[PDB]
Amino acid sequence: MIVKRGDVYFADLSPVVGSEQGGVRPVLVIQNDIGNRFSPTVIVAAITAQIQKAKLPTHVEIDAKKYGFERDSVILLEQIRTIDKQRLTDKITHLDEVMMIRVDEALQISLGLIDF
Amino acid sequence: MIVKRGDVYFADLSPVVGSEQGGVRPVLVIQNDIGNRFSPTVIVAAITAQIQKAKLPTHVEIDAKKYGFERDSVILLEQIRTIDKQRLTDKITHLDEVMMIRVDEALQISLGLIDF
Numbered sequence A, B: 001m002i003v004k005r006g007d008v009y010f011a012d013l014s015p016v017v018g019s020e021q022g023g024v025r026p027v028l029v030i031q032n033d034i035g036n037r038f039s040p041t042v043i044v045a046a047i048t049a050q051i052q053k054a055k056l057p058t059h060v061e062i063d064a065k066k067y068g069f070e071r072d073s074v075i076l077l078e079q080i081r082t083i084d085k086q087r088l089t090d091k092i093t094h095l096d097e098v099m100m101i102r103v104d105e106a107l108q109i110s111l112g113l114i115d116f
Helices: A033-038 A097-110 B033-038 B097-110
Strands: A007-012 A024-029 A041-048 A059-062 A073-084 A088-094 B007-012 B024-029 B041-048 B059-062 B073-084 B088-094
Touching: A007 A041, A024 A073, A033 A041, A041 B073, A059 A097, A073 A097, A073 B041, B007 B041, B024 B073, B033 B041, B059 B097, B073 B097
Parallel strands: none
Antiparallel strands: A007 A024, A007 A088, A024 A041, A041 A073, A059 A073, A073 B073, B007 B024, B007 B088, B024 B041, B041 B073, B059 B073
C-alpha cells in the first residue's frame, strides 16, 4: 500500500480521552503525498456515520453511494490525528477531487487558515 | 483558561503507537479561535526539543529565548492531534504573529494545501 491523500482507510483511533473521536472507523488521509511516501505516519481526519444535528463549516458531508459509503457520513475536519501507518488496515475508497476541494476548505476553516 | 490559537500548553500525548509523537511536551494550539471557544477539543501540533538532523518544510524552528523556550525547539506540523481540553495543563506562552505565519505555511505544506 502506497498511501495517497484522499484515500479512506479503516483505522482504530482508540484509546482516546474525553471528546476525542475514538473507535475503529473510516479515516481520510489529508497529509501531503510527499509525506505519505517518506514518513511512517500519516495525518487523517475522522469520518462518522452519526447524523449531525449541528451543522458546522468544519464538516464535509459524504452522501451515500457516491464516494464509497453505505450511508450518509461526515468527515470531521475538527477531528484530525497523526497516526502511524500501522494503524491503517484496509483501504476502502479514494475521494475524488471535487470532494477534496470541499475537504480543503473545511480543513482551512478548522485550522484558522481562512475565515470561519 | 480561554484557549487561543497560538497558545503553547503542556499536554500528555501518550499513549501513542509507533512513530506517533508521545510524552508530556509543549504543544501549539492551531485550531481556529471559534472552535477554541465552543468545542471541548482543540487541535495542537507537537513541539520537540530534540535537534533535527533532517530539515523539512513541515518544521518550524523556535529559537531559544524569544518565544518562551529555554532551548532551540521545533514545531512539528506533521505531528498534529485533536485533543480534549482536559489534556492541557499549564499554559506556557503564546507565539506572536510572525511565528504563526511561519506555522501557517508549514501547516499548509504538511496538509497538501500548497506545494511542498
